[model samples]
Each structure stands twice: as C-alpha cells, then as structure tokens.
Target: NAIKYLGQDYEQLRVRCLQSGTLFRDEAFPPVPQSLGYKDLGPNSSKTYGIKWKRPTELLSNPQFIVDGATRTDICQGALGDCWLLAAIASLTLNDTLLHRVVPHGQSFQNGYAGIFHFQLWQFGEWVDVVVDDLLPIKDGKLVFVHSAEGNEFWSALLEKAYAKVNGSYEALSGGSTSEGFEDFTGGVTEWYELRKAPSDLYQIILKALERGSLLGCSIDISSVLDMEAITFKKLVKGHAYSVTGAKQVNYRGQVVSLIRMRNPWGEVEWTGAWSDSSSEWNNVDPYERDQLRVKMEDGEFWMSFRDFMREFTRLEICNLT
Candidate 1:
C-alpha cells in the first residue's frame, strides 16, 4: 500500500513534509560524496575531496528552478566535461512539449521547501517518476557538475542529479550520450550515421528529421584523446558532442548555400569557418536569409556549411520520438 511509482511519490512526500512541518531529505540518495557513486571512477579526482552538497537556498541568495525557461543558451558552455548526454540535453530544448514533460514544472525553492524534486524518465518499458533531493554537488561555492549559464538557475544541474540516481551513481555516467540521452528522456530509439561516407542527401535527411519533430546529436569522429586540442583551430571540439538542430539552404550571390546549425555544450568558442558567426560570406546572401542566419550568439551555437559540416564532423545520431 505504501509503494509508489519508481519508489516514492513526490506529492505524498511533499504533503507529508508539509503536514510534519519539516524539509525533506532522501536517505536513498544522501548528501555525501559516496552518493556520487565515484565507484571505480578511476582516478580519485582532487575535486572529490572538497565535494560537498547543499540545497539551492543554501548555495545562493537567489536560486531558481528555471530562469526564463530552458533554452539551449541556458546549458552553459559545458566546458568542464565531456559529451553525448549534453548533446541530447541540448536537443531536448528544441521542443517545448517534451521539455515540459521531462523536466515537469512547479518544483521550486521559492514556495515548496520540501527539498525534493521529481522527473519523468523512460525506464525498461515505462515512464518512471524518479525523484531526487535538491542537494546539489558543490565545491568551494561552485557547482561541480553540469551547470546552467545563469549563476542562480538550477534545472540542468538538478536534472543531472535525477539522472545520476537512475544510474546508481554519477560515476556510471562517465561514458554516455544524447542519443542514449535522446532515448532516455523521450523513450525513443536512435539511428546513427557516419559522416565520413555521409549520404548524398544527408541534409534532406536532417531536414526531414526536424520536420517530423525528431532530434539530432552529433560529434567529430575522433581517433585519439588528443583530438580535442588538435581541432581547436577550427573552433570545434573533437571527441566531444554537439547538438545538431536546424538546417537551411539560402541564396548567396543567388547560389544555394546549404547550412546546418548546432549548439556546443561548452558555451564558448565557436566555428570560425565559411558561414560562421562573423563570416564575410554572409554579406552577399539573400536579405531574408542574411536576416535569419546572420545573427551571432556567443553562447556556443553557430552554423556551418553543409560541406564543411560533412568534412569536419563524423558521427551523427538522429532520434524520432513517437
């Protein structure tokens, strides 16, 4: 009779807390580094020693469950870590309905102070309402994991903790994905593409994917660990993932210029090529496209020529949530 979806019911727990006049603390996932499940995370990261947990109100003067809602720009630059999951996370922002479904709404530090939050995730064959306490991992007053760009906003960071709980520990997430992540939040399967021998009509495929409300996550085909540093000249990161969003073709000097837009998880440093943010190539383009595509965002989102995209990037994951 006490069993609940995925274990505990958020409504019941919060109500219980309200009735008892106390804040909630999850013993299942407590405020400790071991909760990180640094289980064989390999090296003992020095950051672990100082790693501590705190509630949103405890961490900052003004913490928000979300700030102006979750857009790709809010994902920060993702500079502190690696990819796939972040790529998938970026894709999630493209659709409002799915975003609202996965992240849910109403949990906040402003009014409800039970210190617990819940998210709906696709488990083996069901949508499980997984729960997590708001005790975020912190060290020296800074969030230690996936953080939003806004100093006081916390949905993404808290989302990561909910995911960490699902995996047994945050360490289990050491090697991961946005497609798998695509699969997780949406309960969908993904198709993979190798950009090296990319399909002749790949751009149309991308066009079709997005048109049908699909999502894409991609990364450079990496050969080694050092690849991340080697590709900086191109203003791109290798072995790291990026979320492929929209695609378009426009007239440049009346010639069709195909383009693809993607957002980097790490919020800074962007593509510096043909149709990049500052590309002079945009000067001769159709006025409407120039108006549409020429906007510059320093927050890790930029466009690239489809040809250049094919040449530089190698892996692509497309998922259609039915």
Candidate 2:
C-alpha cells in the first residue's frame, strides 16, 4: 500500500477528549462494517448501470491516503464500486508488463509526482493517453478538503487535475441515490464532455466521443453457479469492466494507484470490490492503504488490459468518442 503518519498532534486530543468525550474509547467497537455490493449487470442479470461493488477496508495497510503527511499503500483496492477498474488493476497486479507499460505505476520510470499518471482514452476508434491527475482534492477551495495542515493547495491541484468535472459538487460525492446522483453530477452537461474519459489505448478513436462527452458504459455476465457463489461471497465478480475516469496513485502505497472512479448505469448497485470488507484482495492487505504492501495476488484488482476486457465482457461501450 503506502506510508502512514503516526506522529503526534494529540496535545489537543486529550483536551478535546476531556471536554466533549463520552467514554474512554466510545463504548464498544462495533463490528467493522462490511461493504455492500453493487448489482451484477449482464444479459443473465438485470440491465442496470453504475458502480455495483466497492473496496474492502482490509486492503488498506498504512491507511494514509487523506491523512496529513500520509501516503496510503496503493498495492490493493479499498472500498469503491468500480470492479471494472479493479479488474484492470488485478491484471496489472499480475502482469508487470501491463502494469509497468500500460498502467502508470507510482514509481514512474519518468520522474513525476504522485496521483499524476498518463492514461489513454478510447473515442472515435482510437486510443489516446493524455497526461492526467489521479490525486484527490485537498486544496483550499476544493471539495475534498477546505485545507489540511498538510497542504490544501496540493490537494486542490491534485483533485482538479484528476477529477476534471465531478458528477456534481462535494455534496454529490457522498453516498446517495445513484440515478439521481448521476443526474445531479452530470445534470448540467450537454453530453459526456464534462465527464472524465475512461482509459483506453485508442485515444484517437475515442477523441470524438470525448469531445461529445458520452458515457463509456460497460457490463459483464457472472451468473454461472461458481461465479454466482463467488459473487455472493465477494458480492461481485472478477473481470467486471467499466469506464475509467480518474485515478489516485500512491508511492507509499506501492508503485500503484489507490483510487479510481467509475459509473454504474443503475447507480444503485455498487461493486463493493477490493475496497469492500469482503473482498479477497483485502485479505492480505492491512489498514487498507499504506504499509505492508500486499505482494499483489496472482489475480488481484489493480489493472486490466483493453484486449482482455473486450474478451471477458459481454458488453463494452465507447460512447461517442467520435
């Protein structure tokens, strides 16, 4: 995963605790909440949309993606509803060739900052990987944070660079009605122009669609008895594909990205992928983000190839890249 901040700022901690704290450690530690899964949309399943799965917290190792002066490990997934991305990540984890060549590893052969990676988007039948930012908003004026002692401007720039146009405002990021949320986030846009393009090699192919701004939707089937049971346990399936919008790679997290965004058609069903509590990827990971980077599973969620994606999925959409 990545590094963590274990320094001291607890001087005020004791005071705050004495003034308003109820119990020493808040009664009982509730069972760590298990992640909810998104719907499995396919011909065999419902014709729905939007993210249906999430990352499990167990994936977090150092757990410092947003903490002050912290870098969460990117070695694993941690509670997001983007299995498509996770599938890609899984592939990346397995294939160093793909992970090093196609996907951006935090440890860039080229000198660069964290959260900033070059990715190609497909539109109009071509692939183009433009310079993109994967960092979350931590700037003064950004939504992710007003300002952290760490650095607000840094956060803001990272988020703006990564998240070109949010579904809406900070308000939209919180969990809610997916359809309504998607609409709210995408409400003002004429088309997909406002949304970040999913990663694809045929940048030129999808250029037109990127300009038009269309949703690059995708779906896969996982209804086999084995798959069904796996999905039931994992709450999702492998090889799930989706469009890429943005990514957040962390060095401390381990030469990889931590967060990526995807959209579900139904919006209600979440992937609950590696980020969810029940994900297989989470088993080896600790704290969810940084420290003790999991030696990526032979088949973990971290990266996928377009070629493989096309082969595994039942449906793939490029929208109107052209």
Candidate 3:
C-alpha cells in the first residue's frame, strides 16, 4: 500500500472533521495567492490576476463532486496552460478501471461534507495519496483552471487541484508534457516520437499501445513555444496540445489505411483534412463500422489519416501500460 502524502490521512482527517463538525481547511495548501504561485503577487505589487478562492456551494446551489461519472467529453481546459494534463485526463477516461485508480471512488459533496478530497498520483515510483481541501480558485464566477462542461460537476476541477497541490502550486502545472501527466498518473513507461522521423511500424505500435491500455498525445511544430492555442489554417492549433483518442487500420477500397482520432482539450476546432469526421472518406467504411466511430459531440474530437497526423503534428507521446 502507498503512504499518505504529507503524512495526512484523508479518511482519518475527515473523521476528525466530522466529529468536530468543522469544514476542512488544509494548512499545508491554504486558500491564498501564494498557493497560486504567482511571482508578482507582492503585497505592494500592482499586478494581480484578480483570482479568489471559493467553495463549491459558494459558486453553485447543487454542486456535485462528479455528475454521472467522468467522461472524456465532460472536460474543457480553463484559464491554465495545462492542456497537456487535460489531454492525459481525456485519455484516462477511456479506461474506467485506471481512472478510478487515480481519482478513487466514494468522494462526493454530501454526507459529512468537510471540504476535503484526495487523489493518488505516482511520484517517483510510489503512488502517493495527495490530500486537498475543496476550496478552488475562481475568477468572475468561473473556475480558473480545468472545469467540466456541466458546471455542477466538480470532479475534474478538484482532480486538477489535487494535482496542483502535489506539484506545490497551480502555476507549477503550466505547460507540461503528456508523458509527465501519464507517468505520474500510472507510474508507467512513456516514449516520444518526432513523427516524420518515426518508424514505419509506428501505426502498428500505436494500435498495440491502444490494445495494451496506454495513453497517447501529440502537438504540432511551432516557433512560438510561449504561444497557447494558436490555430493554423488547417483548423488545427499550433503550439497547442491534444490527446489521441484512438488508432486503427481499416479497409479503404482494396487497401487498408491507418486512422487516428484526436481530441483538442479546448473541446472544439477540429482538423480539416483528409479522413476528417465530415469528409467523404466515410463513404468507404461500412455503416456498422462507421457508426461505431461516428460517435460525435461538440468536444473537438475528429478522425484524421495517420499520414496527416504525421505530416501536421511534429511530436507524439505514448504512455505505455505498466
């Protein structure tokens, strides 16, 4: 069994809070600007992000820790540059067993509510249970980081907060690789690829990765490393991050072609290329197979040829099964 992070046992702390009938206040991670890790938040400094911390009830009437369970389409990136984390989270949704491994179960806002929650993240080969108070950063009536499409759902936001706590501060989560997120979540092995220079068996390898329950993510080449979500003419964003939802080789005419499905964490703006969801390429696949892959939402998910995937995207990160 893994040790409790910071020697704080979530179950024990919650029992104490219930006995005392007090809301949990994590002194280790107080609801303050310093927890936000702002460099210019000096007392006299004029610069400020206008952020404030508030409990879920303070924001909404009927808040839920999770509403109808976690789904890939339920997530949308917020006021942070942690789309990479969101991408890994989106992939995490596919494997419900593993998702619960990281997120755990039985956490909610009712029945001895103490404003406390916990998650298990793999840190240095050890799965550490990270405890966090439920006070989340809010600005102008909106969550300041990863949020759910359904505003009442708070699991995604709280999950992000737990991660921020483990990393020391919210700012420390900015601009990370998908491998970092996946490795921490599962303590699994990860590999990277510069697509153009990748191996010919890469497609087969991705299919294997899928079969073996691994995570996938990719990013396009860009000069602006500092830029976030800059959309290119192809309707794909440069310098932004996305998760590979699926990979497959299917028959088209007389030959089999590889296809990769991706989802942008922003949840909209799909790729406009060959084999896209809206393309005539769907004409080739039979309805049974087509409808199976035709599952659609406004969630920025789309299918593209593996050729275009390699041509447009510059890098790929695969977090293989343990």
Candidate 4:
C-alpha cells in the first residue's frame, strides 16, 4: 500500500491557512483554475470570477474536521453539479468502515499539522493516496464547492478535493452517476434500477439489501419537458440525487407499512409527502416506534411510502460492498 510505504511520515502541509494571510501554493498538485478552461463554476456564478481559499478556522471561530462521524445531514451540495457524488458520500456515512476507508481518520486543524492532508480513494482497481492543500475555494468567504452543514467542518470538502484530484480536475466531477461514484469510493459493484420496470417485490429487495449493509441512491428525471425548478412539489429537487438512508417494513395502526427514508445532500430540502416527518401518518405510530425509527424533524431527512418512492423516483441504484 502507498500509505504503508510512508509509514509514520506525515506529509508536510503545503498551503497556508487563510488566517495566516499567506499565499497558498499547490506544491503537491496545483489546482486547475478557471483561467485554464475549467468553466464549471456552479450555479449563477461567472466563469471568470475569482474565488478565495480559506481554512475552516479562518471562516469560523472554532473549526472541526468531523463531529462524531460523517452523516447524511452533514453533507451539503455547493455550486457544483456533482450531486451524484455528494449523494454517494452521504450514503457512505451510513457505513462506518466504508466511510473510514475513503476518508482517513485523525485529521483536524488542531492536530498540529500544516494545511496538507491526504485521503485514500479506490482508483481503477487499487487504493491510491491523494494529497491536497487546505486552501478551499470561497466566494463571499464561504466554501464554493461541496461542504458540511457545520461551517467549521472541512472533512467533506477535503475529501471532495482528493476525489477531484483523482479525476484530473474538479470539472471532471461535474456530471456523473452515483453508481460510478459509489464504486470508486467503496471498490464495490453497483446495480441500477428503473422503478417503472422494477419487480413487484422491489420493497423486499430493498429491505434485504439494507439488511446486508448496502448503499442506495435515487434520482428523478427533471428535463426541460417537465418545466420543473430545483425544488419542486413536496420540496423534492428535480434532476438531483438523494441518498437512501433506510428501508424496512413495520407495523403501524394495526397494519404492516413499508417505508423508505431518504436524505438530500443540501441538508435542508426534504420530501413533504405522505409519511413525511410532519405527515399525519406519524400520528398513527406510537411515540416509542417514532423514537426507534429515529425520526429527525426538519433535518434534511424524510420518510416515504415504498409505493410513493417507486412512483416519484425514476432511477434507483444500489452499491453492494465487497
């Protein structure tokens, strides 16, 4: 392993914290700026606009690389079209071992390290080490790409940079399949599903997969023909990928009900349809069951009936970890 060769050597930090007011240099691997023809600036920003890079501590009073551990609620898609990868990252949080495999542990601003950090990514067929500077792109003093819900956290953003490095440039990650991203992150095989053509026992299939620690993602086809905006009915976004957080069957109101929980990478938007957090359906379920289900209110997470999930989402993907 590349890391095994390094042994206990910690790579020297190359980029300086923004608070230091020093210029950041890509002594490791220089970032491809827009000047070099990277036009994907993400939502409503000019291609020629300049972006500032700041460390999390410079942006917040107290910074944290990760609080507790990664979670779906911790992810937020920035001004990039990499929701596919973002969704995959959100799903990765549900599995601790899988997440730690990609995002190495023991990284923090308080760790007495410079601005340099590293992560291991499953590239091609082998795990490769990627080193990146702490200089994150900023517009209006805020992160410009994928970031965490907590302003102080930088693990997700740093991980995004490592992935970008593997794919030539951040632009290369603009548009992709969660399935592809999931494979790259976990070195696993993925299965694609068209809900319309799915078998009648699809609910059982999802339950079985979840029981086996599978990761799932889904998306809707929001094309010009639909004339839909980013946030459509029920607060669900169009043309965006969502991480499938849960799938199971439970008895509620004297009947067995199938439910699926999903989360948005934006960490705010959520489904507002039946079985949603505030839906009347929860009234029928006991408070103990609610706690057991871990119903988080207004936390970028929502529950939907398996029937509704099949009807609303067009594409579903599952990554079976090896």
Off by over 4 Å in 4: 3-25, 31-37, 42-48, 176-183, 225-229, 294-296
Tens digit of lDDT per residue, candidate 2, span 167-186?
A: 21222222311122232212
**Candidate 1 local lDDT, 1-322, one digit each (tens):** 2224457888889889988988889877777666675644323666476677888888777889889888776675322343676666778888778788778877787786788888876566566787788887777788877888888998888887777777666765555333433235455676778887878888899999877767798876555665544456778877677888789998878788888999887766789988888888888887777887777768788989888898888788887786
lDDT (CA) per prediction = 0.75, 0.30, 0.80, 0.73
lDDT of 1: 0.75
Tens digits of lDDT, candidate 3, 261-295: 99999888888777777787878877666778865
What are the TM-scores, per candidate, against the unseen true structure?
A: 0.91, 0.25, 0.91, 0.86
Judge candidate 1 at residue 52 and give its lDDT. Answer: 71
Indicate whether candidate 3 or candidate 4 has the larger lDDT: 3
Residue-level error in angstroms, candidate 1, position 167:
0.5
Native-structure RMSD, model 4:
4.1
Between candidates 1 and 3, the lDDT winner: 3
Task: For model 2, state the Cα shift of residue 263 in Å.
Answer: 21
What are the per-model numbers of colliding residue pairs?
A: 9, 102, 0, 0
Span of 10 residues, lowest total lDDT, candidate 4: 4-13
* Model 4 lDDT tens row, 1-322: 5552123223433333444644345544464363112565533348526776666667776777888677776788877777888888888888778778778787777755566677777776676777776777787778878877777788999888777766656666776444443345555677788998998888888888777778788988765735543677678887788889898666779898898988887777788888887778777877677767757566777889898898998989887877
Q: For candidate 2, what is the lDDT? A: 0.30
Could you list the CA RMSD of all candidates, in the order they appear?
2.8, 18.0, 2.5, 4.1
User: Which of candidates 2 and 4 is the stronger one according to lDDT?
Assistant: 4
